[PDB]
Structure 1
């Protein structure tokens, strides 16, 4: 049902998120974190759904 995206940015090893999933491509995910739209390589993003709800 619903997805949130957690991701890593510019060198920063801290995970960021939740961000809104805008679009999923083969190599990148487009997300919105608060007020910034970001294009994130798939390998640096985890798209997590609210499985237990």
Structure 2
């Protein structure tokens, strides 16, 4: 439903699983690694086309 794309490296990483959305950061899981990414450096894109 939701997929998160992020930057750590200007190359955009992802897609990652959305674990939690905070007011200043998002918690994601890329592969087996849990990452905390600020809101400004993340893109939570929904499968709108469906």
Verify same fold: TM over 0.5. Answer: yes
Q: Secondary structure at the match of 2:40?
A: helix
In structure 1, distance between residues paired with 2:28 and 2:22: 11
Flag structure 2 segments of 5+ consecutive residues without an equivalent: none
Following superposition, the deviation at residue 42 of structure 1 comes to: 0.3
| TM-score computed with the length of structure 1 as normaliser | 0.94
Flag structure 1 segments of 5+ consecutive residues without an equivalent: none
Q: 4+ residue runs of structure 1 moved beyond 4 angstroms?
A: none
| TM-score computed with the length of structure 2 as normaliser | 0.99
C-alpha RMSD of matched pairs (Å) = 0.2
Following superposition, the deviation at residue 26 of structure 1 comes to: 0.1
> Alpha-carbon deviations, 1:20-39, whole Å to 9, x = none?
00000000000000010000
> Alpha-carbon deviations, 1:1-53, whole Å to 9, x = none?
x10000000xx000000000000000000000001000000000000000000
